[model samples]
Target chain A: HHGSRELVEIIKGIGIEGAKEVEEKVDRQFYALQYLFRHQDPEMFIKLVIANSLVSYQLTGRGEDWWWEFARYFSGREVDSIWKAYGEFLPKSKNNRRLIEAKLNRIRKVEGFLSTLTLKDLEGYYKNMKMLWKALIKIMGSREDSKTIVFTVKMFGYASRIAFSRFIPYPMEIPIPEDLRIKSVTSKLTQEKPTKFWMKIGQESGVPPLHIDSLIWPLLGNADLTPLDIELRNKLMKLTELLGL
Target chain B: ELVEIIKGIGIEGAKEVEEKVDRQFYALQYLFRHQDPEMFIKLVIANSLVSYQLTGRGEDWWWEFARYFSGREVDSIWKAYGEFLPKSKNNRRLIEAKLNRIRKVEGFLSTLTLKDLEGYYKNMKMLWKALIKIMGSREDSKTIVFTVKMFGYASRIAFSRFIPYPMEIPIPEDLRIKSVTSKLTQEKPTKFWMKIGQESGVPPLHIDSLIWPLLGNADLTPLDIELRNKLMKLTELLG
Candidate 1:
């Protein structure tokens, strides 16, 4: 009895706010997912891909705020809306780089394909997402399926959680997507690497499996980190010290 | 002026044909500018009859095709296309027959394996079919002639030209390459510059490469892409 209680306590002993802050962040994303769920359009799917794509670019030395920079490309209306706001993306100005044009061109491809779908295609959306993943890997020269799946699954997970279809698993029911942060921290914490590993972690820690993910995500991120990482890691150190012994 | 003319076509090794340009430089130039090679080259054989009518060089069109290319794996591209085919069963018949024929010629796209009788189409048809699945669902005649014609002979300069292999990928020919080369004479343009390497002779791709820069503009529209596609099909069918 002490063993079960000990692991759960050590995990929670890290901090209450530690898990709380991560839950709030995920809740915000869940809200974003609801926004996407209402639209049920491909631009939203395109948005999912864009939000997830940050990790891919960051590997090549792009700054951590890459997602913020790319937000202008998809933060509002349809392609027309983007045009109204930004006035012709990547105008052939002397200041603009073709590389930026290249990124915009990719967004256009993802959006173009996604915009064609409707509720009729909703059933096959995950299959199409696979197709999207394949196209992105090739087009972007991205790392691997596991990396892209993190954002993809969450997008779909959230999509289903709020209900886009009938009887799809709760977002928690879906297997956690393997990603840089998720994988590294999970493996760092425990070597389980099997079905529902994150869920199992959550079970041990007395939180939703994904909530465990929320706790780990900020610790590893470069975003607002000067104040955040140490503040976050102060609790994580408690968990790490346990791992060390 | 001769040197200027040779340099003008934008051919990769035009210097070898450094002498081929007599007066058609401007004609080739006019034909070359409008093509978005990616659109035209893939659509040419897939549409055959319709490509000339529906070619588009616009940004949206290129990205549509770009999606087809998003999966680096050719297998996914082949699979992603699912059941998409030409507008007519008859058109599909003609295209499938032609595609089946291209498989006979040996080449890259290393993933597709040839089986007994199906070898011909496996090689040629699949490459074009996957491309067709991406393009021609929405096209018109304005994009037809110049664009498809342009793609037939020339578009591969950006594509197959980069592949590592037989060194000279005979320029993909058809209505476009032949039409323009014939501008010089009854002599074939690729062979028109045959003096490059008589060993296998100048790879048509290399010959075309020698001359594409002569046309001077790097921005080729769908018509340009399809024109080369059609010409490449013609070269295969006629050869």
Candidate 2:
């Protein structure tokens, strides 16, 4: 059986409050891009996030470091080309570097789609995240649950918040990213399909599943937070309580 | 007979490989020799199985692997699968099944000591049976053939000598080898290449060495300018 309704309520509470707190103050990934693409237009920022998400799998280092390092590399370079950026950054990625040809091919396909869009088109896509999600699935030739696709969607939402100063919450249909961290917590909660389990939780809790994901992420050893780590450091108490801790 | 069709393409390919690239893997060998030759050999064996359908070229993949796992002692299949293999570009697809194959390989490797591998230089049949037992009886499958070639590559570089590439094993029927074979002759690629090996005095693996660069997108930066230019002629000649 899934955890008690009390646990679901705690998750809902976190999703409504704690996840937003983490997203605004603690999520360094959204902020890390500021230093790099701060001068460039929103289109460039969107493209950089898309490119980074495309090659996000099988990282050799911590996710924070990888994103920060990419920002550093891209900031130092004169060229604004995503293609040139990928070429420079990929070689620097050591270990588990087997099928980069495939990753590059993914970049080629996604870039073909991304290059056609302007800032207005992106804002239009933001109106319907489902439409944006389907297009990404078709372009990347991946499923709805694909890790990179969902992660890109999350980052795209983050980008919208920064660029337009509007809080576009993820729709419920978009399942929480079932990466290893999510998978572990989902396993503890239920034996059912993680996507369906989280969907139900999203339905009951009134929190979009992705926001719930943000709430749980830092609690599960994901330490990418602001200088006052201790503020959320106490917040993990609510986190562990929901996990039956 | 077979050489006439392959002709200039075959001879120069073999000669270029022998002269320029024969001892090149020693650099890779040097990376892992100090800490644990056994761990490095295990990495080579696991790499051979997962080398197909790579996202990038083989040289880049291996060098990345060397950099990551050089001094690390990955003693179990799970350690490699959980911690290492997922990072690899080659291991991106068919992951759970790939882990199964790696588990089978680990089972096979667990039985052999470093000394046991050295002895296979003298006794190739023993090596064949061991491989067959773990990987099944399809000796000509790309995975199997590639595994043997990597073994030879690793063994020679690490221990200074390994079993000569025997003529009995056919050239690995990679897409490049098959495409080139279809143009050269319609007979099965392995048989055709085996006959060429027998007649040309180059072993099938050596023939693979010759043909691999000419046909595939393998890294060839180590070749001399003269040899590099000479090897470039084959893509057209064979085309």
Candidate 3:
């Protein structure tokens, strides 16, 4: 379910082309939905940045549509038509419904904080990646004590990736999301898990980390892995024993 | 017991607050007053600095400190601020040091108009530069207890009113707030304040204002019983 050199060599040459195509499709879908769902304003996109990524549970085991739906719901949107359009469309897991709504309410609070800013002030905040990232996390974080708010690694990645990818291409050399699969695969492949070890691999391979992530992700773009394995004869095998795999 | 409670703060403190607690609360019942943020910001920053100087906990310094500047104009306020401060000099330079850091963010404070300041009582981080400064080694925003106290300071000035929202922040651990609500409720501090926010549909700071006037006649009559029930039910339902 994760990726490997046996995985990488199989994916190496062939997967790169499709990666761009899928990136465009995902990017376009994000913009197009702004029209499909009129209430999806970019200002409130900060709210979607939350639901589409961190607060999203893998409900329905089908990821994409729900991400889109929740993006509409928490969109920090003001319109009623957009509200009803996505309100009924909730996560399949009933238990998560409270947690998600809680998150929705939480992000709306951020939206209110943001409401204080002028468009120019927001541009100032958004210009610096560190500033924008911290603002998002803080606004979404505790208004009381500083300690309790927590985000998983994948949540941060997906959030930055989704948020930055929506406008500019991925935020701040953003790492690929570290899911159970991402973690399982990358840690084994790179041996030394510094920060986003696969990103380190991407640097050596001359591929951007996002591109590498897309290529190796078994779930992404519905990519098939076996054919590459057969073609490369698991070329990744040569390095694994060296990597301490 | 109530007079003894007042005396713990000091005789002058007791006399002053005895004069203030009701005078301020009385003013709130009839009208909506607002502070000029320009003055309010400096007062609070100075208050935090002075608080750091004195040692940080209790209502006495906060109340007396607030009274000194209560009705004064900018000149006398800053004049008195200087004296009250060498007062900063004696405080080990902490106040002047933070005072300099506070000057840099005057621009951020100036940017907020009366409208923005209105929302700030409920959301202090709106003034992050100042809040963060006072937050001090804030593994816990030591500002919480003091912050809640200051919120009471500002709320009484802001007119003791609001629209509902989760306190989203901690209420004071101040015994005035805590002792009153503590024995009355069974939940831990954070949860207890949260229950108040839910019951009142008002955030925690305002909850403090709402709970206080009911105590003006500490003998605990029907109005007190009803209000305390309102405050207690705030917790009982949440758990």
Candidate 4:
């Protein structure tokens, strides 16, 4: 039965690609579910769902939804029954119940927040979400009991998010056309002290070269073209304006 | 008969007889019978009268005494005793000259007795003294050589063991200064001097200043002072 559940997950991974090659493979899905129902144990299913949820969260930035999806697969009634049964099998402490309830609520909250994000908001959300994820990883990894398959997936998700957000691209200056040439200057150390001189000039001017790279690169790239969209320029200008650079 | 008489008198009577003897033979025999021959010889040598006679007899009696008294013992004992006495300059030349005469005389004499003993003692004394003196001088020279060698060994070992690590010494900057003097006295600037200055991080201290603390004088216990100072400094540095 445990094997059948694993087989189902494997089939899901293989999907319609393998399904087209082997006609009988499609039939195996029903057979696998049937085996799960007949011989599948509740504890094993709970473990599988927890394991899958962790993997899903690690691979995609979405963790809470995956956990809820795991909980849903087991069904709300079955999950509650398992909890009640687990409560009987273990200690009857208020703390244990509170911990389980809090984890469940947190999963729900994550799912809600993830659903509301647009493409632009995702970048910022992912950045902050990663910070929270790293904190959770530290907490889970340090704890003895929490070093489980489920906790591991949650930790990976948090760690990856933190790592990915650090490399987000920012605007940088383009070298002058003469400077870009392969063999123009014998020594790059010019007497002008270019960086310092430019910075001084920027401080004196009330309208500092805020969107220097943004304006300069596009103008250089397209010599004949003029600005068609004022709104795009305005949005681009806001990036420099916010920084006051 | 003399042996029985001496044995009957016991060790105390034998000692009295030994003390009464003016001749070396009676004293030596008594000493040989009662006490150890080597110790007897050493005691006789320590006495001025017996020592003068022994030295006067020179090489011949010395060999005779060695043969009669110490024949049963190994030759190394004679060699050890011979090492202490001074050498005669003419001994080697005399031995070479009289070698045929001595061999001819030895052929004529069947056995040596008290009658022939005096002559034997006189001749053998001269010969033995020469040999003993030659060997003694050689031994003395070797001993001096060994003493000098051992002193060097001891000094080197002690210096290496007690000297502190080099890093603890105070190093000066100008001590590393090198002068670039030329006969031409050209005003040309060169990179070599600047390169050397940059490379030599800390300068060398005076050799006297570095080694003064390690040396001992009559007024001060340099070793003890240096050890104590080093240990305290090391402890403070660690802290």
Ranking by TM-score: 2, 3, 1, 4
Off by over 4 Å in 1: A1-20, A23-64, A75-113, A116-145, A155-170, A180-199, A203-208, A221-245, B1-239
Candidate 2 DockQ vs. native = 0.01
Number of the candidate with higher TM-score, 1 or 3 = 3
Model 4 complex DockQ against the native: 0.00
The full ranking of all candidates by lDDT, starting with the best, is 2, 3, 1, 4
CA shift of A59, model 1, Å: 4.2
lDDT of 2 by residue, B1-239 (tens): 34643454354456446433433253254344434666667677776776667666565555555545645766685557666667665346666766777888887788878898777656655666677778675777777776777776677655754356776777888776788889878999989878887776667877777665655554344444455665666556666
How high is the lDDT of residue A24 in model 1?
Answer: 26
lDDT-better candidate, 1 vs 3: 3
Each prediction's DockQ against the real complex: 0.01, 0.01, 0.01, 0.00
In terms of docking quality, model 4 is incorrect
Instruction: Give TM per candidate.
Output: 0.30, 0.47, 0.32, 0.13
lDDT of 2 at A207: 83
lDDT tens digits, residue span B1-239, model 1: 22233323234333222212211221221122233433323333332333222233222222233322322333322232323324322123344533442332112233323232133222333333433343433221222222333333332232322221122223444555566666556865444444333343333333454444334332111112333343344233323
Candidate 1, A1-245: lDDT as tens digits? 01235445656655444554333222334333333333334445444434334333223323222222233234443544332322353443222334554545455555544446554454454444445445445554654435444455444544543343222222333345565555665565566662356555556665544445555554454322211224454666555454442
**Residues forming the 10-long window of minimal summed lDDT in candidate 2 chain A:** A222-231
Runs of candidate 3 exceeding 4 Å displacement: A1-20, A26-39, A58-60, A71-98, A101-109, A117-128, A140-167, A187-191, A205-211, A218-245, B1-239
Worst 10 residues of 3 chain B by lDDT: B25-34
Which segments of candidate 2 are over 4 A away from where they belong?
A1-3, A76-81, A94-98, A222-236, B1-239
